Design a protein around this ligand. Structure first.
Ligand SMILES: CC/C=C\C/C=C\C/C=C\C/C=C\C/C=C\C/C=C\CCC(=O)O
Length: 390
């Protein structure tokens, strides 16, 4: 994807950069608003990281450093000095106030034990941690009502999984239900796989066998692009073929929840609902066949039935720690992509119960309590990832 000559030239172009530490301003997960501060050292001087920059034709610049994610995290926690359990700290590389949020890749050591040491996420808005946020010039999704480019009031399921295992998370996921395709073109799983393959050729001592891959895709295609079941099946199979041929060995796979149970479908016709629900059911049977196909070949596959979990969550939310599974927490009573540009109050029922008792944050996307509940159910069912080496 990148020539040997291009790789050394980029890696030898050594420099330094600063770290932007982001945090939730409120102690409540009902308030999505965030702010940032520059990372500092305990003596009060600016915290810098050494390394090199690289971007493909896409021009999403990634900073590659030898400094670990744990060290950078610790610097942010110490700089911010918040006694907020909901601070939900995230960090990025940035030369100054004009710079956007660049992901920092912590390069592995040549001496690497045979165990997972990072999570790589592919998919849609159910996994996106901010890939549309820089392109939108930090205006979409509106950072007062959506948590720093996450289509939720906080962390998504991949972030809870990565945190539970104390691993860094590198995100290639990006959705379409919110009109994301008006800000970045190349959002298909195929383009995400190509991007991942391109950026990891610039990483040092990269062993794909030590990556835990998460993949969830198909709802964007069925809901927003009216794609046929065979073409989504073919893309899903192609992503796994491409990844396994590129040394991937560890996967967290999942069935698609019935998206028609989301609040936005209150405004859809029954014919539209029945078409989407039926496509989800055939895709789920193919996802199970694919998980079994790779499992039979000796790959480490964890398959979670999110569909069956979601059916239980919506039929009896009271049994799963929720009061409402039908309505958004935000006071959004239509399905209009322009609503992602504005600040919204919480509807009375959600203001009263708190966002952690609502399944949905907006008309499409689940709350961070739902994301954590899924992440915890995934970790339990796979016995804190029993077939994976940590
Ligand atoms: C594939 C699901 C696996 C993990 C994601 C974690 C939690 C999801 C939990 C419950 C289901 C919630 C909502 C279903 C409704 C809509 C999905 C939303 C967006 C997908 C399409 C897009 O981003 O364009």
């Amino acid at each position: 994807m990148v020539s040997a000559a291009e790789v050394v030239s980029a890696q030898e172009n050594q420099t330094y950069t600063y770290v932007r530490c982001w945090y939730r301003t409120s102690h409540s997960k009902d308030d999505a608003a965030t702010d940032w501060k520059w990372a500092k050292n305990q003596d009060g001087s600016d915290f810098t990281i050494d390394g090199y920059w690289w971007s493909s034709v896409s021009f999403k610049n990634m900073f590659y450093t030898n400094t670990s994610q744990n060290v950078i995290r610790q610097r942010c926690e110490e700089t911010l000095d918040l006694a907020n359990e909901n601070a939900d700290i995230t960090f990025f590389a940035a030369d100054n106030r004009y710079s956007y949020n660049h992901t920092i890749w912590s390069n592995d050591a040549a001496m690497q034990p045979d165990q997972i040491n990072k999570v790589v996420a592919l998919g849609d808005s159910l996994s996106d941690t901010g890939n549309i946020f820089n392109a939108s010039q930090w205006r979409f999704p509106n950072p007062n009502s959506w948590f720093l480019g996450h289509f939720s009031n906080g962390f998504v399921w991949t972030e809870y999984v990565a945190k539970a295992k104390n691993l860094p998370l590198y995100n290639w996921a990006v959705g379409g239900a919110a009109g994301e395709n008006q800000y970045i073109a190349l959002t298909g799983v195929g383009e995400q796989v190509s991007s991942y393959l391109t950026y990891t050729k610039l990483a040092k001592n990269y062993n794909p066998a030590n990556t835990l891959f998460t993949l969830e895709f198909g709802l964007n295609d069925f809901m927003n692009y009216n794609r046929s079941v065979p073409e989504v099946k073919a893309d899903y199979a192609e992503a796994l073929i491409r990844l396994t041929d590129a040394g991937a060995k560890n996967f967290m796979l999942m069935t698609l929840p019935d998206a028609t149970k989301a609040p936005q479908f209150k405004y859809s016709t029954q014919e539209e609902i029945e078409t989407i629900r039926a496509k989800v059911l055939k895709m789920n049977e193919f996802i199970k066949a694919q998980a079994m196909y790779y499992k039979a070949q000796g790959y480490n596959i964890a398959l979670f039935d999110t569909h069956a979990l979601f059916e239980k969550l919506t039929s009896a939310p009271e049994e799963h720690g929720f009061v409402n599974a039908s309505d958004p927490c935000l006071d959004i009573n239509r399905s209009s992509s322009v609503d992602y540009m504005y600040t919204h109050s919480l509807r009375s029922e959600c203001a009263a119960s708190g966002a952690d008792k609502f399944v949905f944050w907006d008309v499409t996307h689940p709350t961070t309590a739902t994301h954590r509940y899924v992440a915890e159910k995934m970790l339990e069912s796979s016995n804190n990832l029993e077939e994976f080496r940590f």
